[PDB]
Amino acid sequence: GAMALKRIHKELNDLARDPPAQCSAGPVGDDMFHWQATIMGPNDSPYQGGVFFLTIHFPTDYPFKPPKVAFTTRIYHPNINSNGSISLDILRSQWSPALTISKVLLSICSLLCDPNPDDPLVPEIARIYKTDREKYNRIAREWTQKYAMGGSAYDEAIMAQQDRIQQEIAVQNPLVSERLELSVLYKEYAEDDNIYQQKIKDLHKKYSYIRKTRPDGNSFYRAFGFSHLEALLDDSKELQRFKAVSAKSKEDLVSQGFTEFTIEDFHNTFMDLIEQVEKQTSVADLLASFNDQSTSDYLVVYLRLLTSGYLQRESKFFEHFIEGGRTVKEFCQQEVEPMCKESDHIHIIALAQALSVSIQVEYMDRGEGGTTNPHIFPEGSEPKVYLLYRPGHYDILYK
């Protein structure tokens, strides 16, 4: 009940504090007493390359009784039956209330590299391991190849990898940084690197300030959105037109075959973001909105949706502009609609034409001169919104 739950929360806090890369576990959806463990086959095992899942059920009275833990993935091992039950005794008779689920976890992870043919759960496998190790390693490798390597497991594992990566990225940079003097860019690069440093000089010629965004894969939509709202933070009529077209855009999308109730929320977040800018609030407040996870992300989703919408609407125009044999809608389903997918030139033109707005992008990679060349595309317009492109990443520029 009460203290059991509280304790479970404490344990999850501890496990989150010092995350194991090889074996981690956590609650399934809503349920606190039901956890799923993902443990990786240790290198220098037969189990190497495999991904093993466990289920963990915390008794209603906890810590006083040990958690019930079992492998869902089949595994060849003297201490684990094909029924899935784990035979180490800190899970049965030797369990103290002072023990942690983490201790149990690395107890099992340890049990993998170093089995225990002393008190075997599976007499035959014990015999094989104790006598002929060749056969044991071979069989275990085959079982890993079959049961632990499936196209499911691997999806979950890679998902975890991604999450770790942009969690580190998350703690590194905020979604949208405060307005920064771009002299800071000088620090990002080595003094050993002359060419980049001097292209930063050339960028310093044209622009006074820079606003960084997270390298989360959505950086273009995030930057584009923020800078383009902040642009109408003052202009009276532009806010009106933008609000109008953005309002009609939902109807266009719904009419284009998108299910209304799903896109309705994202549209709502978008329009609310236009609402904070409607009667002008200082840039810091809408920035505070953009640094909230789900609000910003919802906005990104909607911008991607608009992008895909206009892409499919004009589809016979873009059709020859895309590499590969993919159709336009396939391209939308793959490289635009889903989150965290990288964006390209096509995306920029599409979103720009979707909101009917102007964009300028400063390309900085390796120049023949220090010159970083601009790209303005509505064709030959006079854009008031500026973005800095460096390879793999978009940022905001302020003149």
């Binding site: 020859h320 990288e342 033109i349």
Partner: protein, 76 residues
């Protein structure tokens, strides 16, 4: 022979080439007219991204064929 290249902005450009002209050469010829540096260019002929080393007749680009210009610009 002369060739066509359509930019993503909607613009269309005519170029002066020959079947033995390399892709890099053509990208330079695009830099002449549109002022865009070659390393920022990715051009596609019928779904296939053209590599800098190859020539025109390598990809079977004949008289009055149409290319498609897109900027590098991949980020997130």
């Amino acid at each position: 022979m002369q060739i066509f290249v359509k930019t993503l902005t909607g613009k269309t450009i005519t170029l002066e080439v020959e079947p033995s002209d390399t892709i890099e050469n053509v990208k330079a010829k695009i830099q002449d007219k549109e002022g865009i540096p070659p390393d920022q260019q990715r051009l596609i002929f019928a779904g296939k991204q053209l590599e800098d080393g190859r020539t025109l007749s390598d990809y079977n680009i004949q008289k009055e064929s149409t290319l498609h210009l897109v900027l590098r610009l991949r980020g997130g």
